[PDB]
Design an enzyme around this catalytic site. Structure first.
Site, mmCIF file in Angstrom:
data_model
loop_
_atom_site.group_PDB
_atom_site.id
_atom_site.type_symbol
_atom_site.label_atom_id
_atom_site.label_comp_id
_atom_site.label_asym_id
_atom_site.label_seq_id
_atom_site.Cartn_x
_atom_site.Cartn_y
_atom_site.Cartn_z
ATOM 1 N N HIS A 55 0.812 -1.209 0.000
ATOM 2 C CA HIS A 55 0.000 0.000 0.000
ATOM 3 C C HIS A 55 0.854 1.272 0.000
ATOM 4 O O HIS A 55 0.328 2.375 -0.173
ATOM 5 C CB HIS A 55 -1.062 -0.030 1.120
ATOM 6 C CG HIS A 55 -0.572 0.392 2.470
ATOM 7 N ND1 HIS A 55 -0.183 -0.515 3.429
ATOM 8 C CD2 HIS A 55 -0.450 1.621 3.034
ATOM 9 C CE1 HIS A 55 0.182 0.137 4.526
ATOM 10 N NE2 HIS A 55 0.025 1.433 4.314
ATOM 11 N N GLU A 106 18.847 7.297 8.579
ATOM 12 C CA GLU A 106 18.115 8.456 9.103
ATOM 13 C C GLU A 106 17.815 8.374 10.595
ATOM 14 O O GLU A 106 17.415 7.312 11.119
ATOM 15 C CB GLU A 106 16.775 8.655 8.367
ATOM 16 C CG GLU A 106 16.923 9.075 6.902
ATOM 17 C CD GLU A 106 17.165 10.580 6.769
ATOM 18 O OE1 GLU A 106 17.538 11.200 7.799
ATOM 19 O OE2 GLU A 106 16.892 11.128 5.679
ATOM 20 N N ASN A 159 16.793 12.156 12.367
ATOM 21 C CA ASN A 159 15.962 13.313 12.017
ATOM 22 C C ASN A 159 15.800 13.414 10.503
ATOM 23 O O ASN A 159 16.792 13.654 9.764
ATOM 24 C CB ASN A 159 16.568 14.619 12.543
ATOM 25 C CG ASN A 159 15.571 15.765 12.493
ATOM 26 O OD1 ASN A 159 14.912 15.980 11.481
ATOM 27 N ND2 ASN A 159 15.424 16.492 13.610
ATOM 28 N N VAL A 183 16.769 16.969 8.861
ATOM 29 C CA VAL A 183 18.113 17.501 9.044
ATOM 30 C C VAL A 183 19.124 16.511 8.517
ATOM 31 O O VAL A 183 19.072 15.312 8.846
ATOM 32 C CB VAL A 183 18.424 17.770 10.556
ATOM 33 C CG1 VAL A 183 19.820 18.373 10.745
ATOM 34 C CG2 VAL A 183 17.374 18.707 11.135
ATOM 35 N N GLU A 228 23.427 9.546 6.680
ATOM 36 C CA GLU A 228 22.430 9.152 5.699
ATOM 37 C C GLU A 228 23.067 8.557 4.464
ATOM 38 O O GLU A 228 24.184 8.916 4.090
ATOM 39 C CB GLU A 228 21.617 10.373 5.250
ATOM 40 C CG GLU A 228 20.770 11.017 6.347
ATOM 41 C CD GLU A 228 21.475 12.155 7.092
ATOM 42 O OE1 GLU A 228 22.704 12.368 6.930
ATOM 43 O OE2 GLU A 228 20.749 12.857 7.822
ATOM 44 N N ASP A 264 0.010 -7.640 1.791
ATOM 45 C CA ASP A 264 0.474 -6.230 1.785
ATOM 46 C C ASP A 264 1.986 -6.154 1.931
ATOM 47 O O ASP A 264 2.524 -5.896 3.047
ATOM 48 C CB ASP A 264 -0.222 -5.457 2.917
ATOM 49 C CG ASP A 264 -0.007 -3.950 2.822
ATOM 50 O OD1 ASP A 264 0.535 -3.512 1.810
ATOM 51 O OD2 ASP A 264 -0.429 -3.211 3.746
ATOM 52 N N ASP A 266 0.367 2.139 19.749
ATOM 53 C CA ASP A 266 0.080 1.527 18.431
ATOM 54 C C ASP A 266 0.987 2.174 17.422
ATOM 55 O O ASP A 266 1.549 3.255 17.674
ATOM 56 C CB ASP A 266 -1.389 1.831 18.065
ATOM 57 C CG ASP A 266 -1.975 0.899 16.984
ATOM 58 O OD1 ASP A 266 -3.185 1.048 16.716
ATOM 59 O OD2 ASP A 266 -1.294 0.037 16.390
ATOM 60 N N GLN A 288 -0.649 6.006 10.841
ATOM 61 C CA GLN A 288 -0.409 6.506 9.482
ATOM 62 C C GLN A 288 0.988 7.107 9.433
ATOM 63 O O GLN A 288 1.392 7.798 10.377
ATOM 64 C CB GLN A 288 -1.447 7.575 9.130
ATOM 65 C CG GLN A 288 -1.549 8.658 10.192
ATOM 66 C CD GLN A 288 -2.622 9.711 9.916
ATOM 67 O OE1 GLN A 288 -2.973 10.503 10.800
ATOM 68 N NE2 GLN A 288 -3.171 9.698 8.704
ATOM 69 N N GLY A 289 1.725 6.828 8.355
ATOM 70 C CA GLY A 289 3.124 7.278 8.208
ATOM 71 C C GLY A 289 4.109 6.232 8.699
ATOM 72 O O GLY A 289 5.286 6.245 8.314
ATOM 73 N N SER A 312 3.360 3.048 8.103
ATOM 74 C CA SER A 312 3.126 2.085 6.987
ATOM 75 C C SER A 312 4.391 1.611 6.309
ATOM 76 O O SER A 312 5.243 2.427 5.973
ATOM 77 C CB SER A 312 2.277 2.788 5.913
ATOM 78 O OG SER A 312 0.974 2.998 6.385
ATOM 79 N N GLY A 313 4.512 0.293 6.125
ATOM 80 C CA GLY A 313 5.665 -0.267 5.400
ATOM 81 C C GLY A 313 6.835 -0.606 6.308
ATOM 82 O O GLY A 313 7.745 -1.326 5.922
HETATM 83 C C1 LIG Z 1 -8.963 -3.635 6.915
HETATM 84 C C2 LIG Z 1 -9.870 -2.724 6.146
HETATM 85 N N1 LIG Z 1 -10.225 -3.114 4.904
HETATM 86 N N2 LIG Z 1 -10.409 -1.587 6.759
HETATM 87 C C3 LIG Z 1 -11.277 -0.657 5.992
HETATM 88 C C4 LIG Z 1 -10.517 0.681 5.892
HETATM 89 C C5 LIG Z 1 -10.032 1.163 7.290
HETATM 90 O O1 LIG Z 1 -9.196 2.305 7.032
HETATM 91 C C6 LIG Z 1 -9.041 3.274 7.998
HETATM 92 C C7 LIG Z 1 -9.951 3.535 9.026
HETATM 93 C C8 LIG Z 1 -9.705 4.566 9.938
HETATM 94 C C9 LIG Z 1 -10.701 4.834 11.063
HETATM 95 O O2 LIG Z 1 -10.751 5.976 11.540
HETATM 96 O O3 LIG Z 1 -11.383 3.858 11.492
HETATM 97 C C10 LIG Z 1 -8.527 5.312 9.793
HETATM 98 C C11 LIG Z 1 -7.976 6.478 10.591
HETATM 99 C C12 LIG Z 1 -6.705 6.744 9.819
HETATM 100 C C13 LIG Z 1 -5.733 7.887 10.115
HETATM 101 C C14 LIG Z 1 -6.499 9.228 10.187
HETATM 102 C C15 LIG Z 1 -4.985 7.598 11.388
HETATM 103 N N3 LIG Z 1 -6.572 5.881 8.824
HETATM 104 C C16 LIG Z 1 -5.418 5.793 7.891
HETATM 105 C C17 LIG Z 1 -4.341 4.782 8.401
HETATM 106 C C18 LIG Z 1 -3.237 4.509 7.579
HETATM 107 C C19 LIG Z 1 -2.230 3.622 7.976
HETATM 108 C C20 LIG Z 1 -2.300 3.006 9.213
HETATM 109 C C21 LIG Z 1 -1.302 2.106 9.640
HETATM 110 C C22 LIG Z 1 -1.317 1.522 10.891
HETATM 111 C C23 LIG Z 1 -2.375 1.760 11.790
HETATM 112 C C24 LIG Z 1 -2.392 1.176 13.065
HETATM 113 N N4 LIG Z 1 -3.409 1.500 13.902
HETATM 114 N N5 LIG Z 1 -1.480 0.282 13.484
HETATM 115 C C25 LIG Z 1 -3.515 2.674 11.401
HETATM 116 C C26 LIG Z 1 -3.396 3.261 10.036
HETATM 117 C C27 LIG Z 1 -4.402 4.168 9.658
HETATM 118 C C28 LIG Z 1 -7.612 5.032 8.771
HETATM 119 C C29 LIG Z 1 -7.882 4.022 7.874
HETATM 120 C C30 LIG Z 1 -9.204 0.104 8.035
HETATM 121 C C31 LIG Z 1 -10.034 -1.174 8.153
HETATM 122 CA CA LIG Z 2 18.539 13.155 8.493
#
Ligand SMILES: CC(=N)N1CCC(Oc2cc(C(=O)O)c3cc(C(C)C)n(Cc4ccc5ccc(C(=N)N)cc5c4)c3c2)CC1
Ligand SMILES: [Ca+2]
Length: 223
Positions: free
Chosen positions: A40, A52, A54, A57, A62, A84, A171, A174-175, A177-178
């Site tokens: 994704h 990396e 910071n 900076v 790096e 994924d 937990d 977002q960010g 990811s990967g």
């Molecule tokens: C499995 C499936 N098919 N589905 C349907 C679509 C849903 O997608 C949502 C639902 C919600 C929600 O509010 O319920 C959110 C909220 C956010 C942001 C604003 C934080 N994102 C983007 C996001 C991006 C990467 C992440 C990587 C990791 C973790 C983590 N908690 N470890 C969270 C992450 C959250 C979401 C993505 C998920 C369930």
């Molecule tokens: Ca740096």
């Protein structure tokens, strides 16, 4: 990473930042020429940034190397998030030393209850938005597949595990990811998905890397 701690510069030497004008995803260095990240996270124009801490900076350790090829898993399903995982080949080999190092692939899967290290430059808030400059870290336990299924109303396959704290508060996000989940010195997971971050009964979900070692090894061997 919500509810984690500052890792410390270069203490996670396999952690990479994927940059397309800005950090957008993490990844894990698995040898001098290959990074594993989440499907994704796929986009074109990827520069891999190794060494990396910071991300805003230039601190002196790096290595910035462009991707020559990206390979999304043949069976990645963007609706369910099944499979994924993506491999990224670097245009040149990274120089390996204490601050830039590859992480071992597993020979066996990890067990529920094991505390693993999850890291990234993702959002550090569960409700708001705040993005850190330095690498953040979190220790989290792998939860049983049954626990993970009891919690969620979304699809969970045998290619996913969940880890974290059902009470909330800690937990990945977002960010992140990967990025890596490392358990007993092995890369066991990739930050994949979650319903929000650090919410009650909504743990983090991770690509179960042990299922993919044959695909990883053969893909690298032929590319
Ligand atoms: C499995 C499936 N098919 N589905 C349907 C679509 C849903 O997608 C949502 C639902 C919600 C929600 O509010 O319920 C959110 C909220 C956010 C942001 C604003 C934080 N994102 C983007 C996001 C991006 C990467 C992440 C990587 C990791 C973790 C983590 N908690 N470890 C969270 C992450 C959250 C979401 C993505 C998920 C369930
Ligand atoms: Ca740096």
């Amino acid at each position: 990473i919500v509810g984690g701690y500052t890792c410390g510069a270069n203490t996670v030497p396999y952690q990479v930042s994927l940059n397309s004008g800005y950090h957008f995803c993490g990844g894990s260095l698995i040898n001098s020429q290959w990074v594993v990240s989440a499907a994704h996270c796929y986009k074109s124009g990827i520069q891999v940034r190794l060494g990396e801490d910071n991300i805003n900076v230039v601190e002196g350790n790096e290595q910035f190397i462009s991707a020559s090829k990206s390979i999304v898993h043949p069976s990645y399903n963007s609706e369910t998030y099944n499979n994924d995982i993506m491999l990224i080949k670097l245009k040149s080999a990274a120089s390996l030393n204490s601050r830039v190092a590859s992480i071992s692939l597993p020979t066996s899967c990890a067990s529920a209850g094991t505390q693993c290290l999850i890291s990234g430059w993702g959002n550090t808030k569960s409700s708001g938005t705040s993005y850190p400059d330095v690498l953040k870290c979190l220790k989290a336990p792998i939860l049983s597949d049954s626990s993970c299924k009891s919690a969620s109303s979304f699809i969970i396959t045998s290619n996913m595990f969940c880890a974290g704290y059902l009470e909330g508060g800690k937990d990945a996000c977002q960010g992140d990811s990967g990025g890596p989940v490392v358990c007993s010195g092995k890369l066991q997971g990739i930050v994949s998905w979650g319903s929000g971050c650090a919410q009650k009964n909504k743990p983090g979900f991770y690509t179960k890397l042990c299922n993919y070692v044959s695909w990883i090894k053969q893909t690298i061997a032929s590319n």
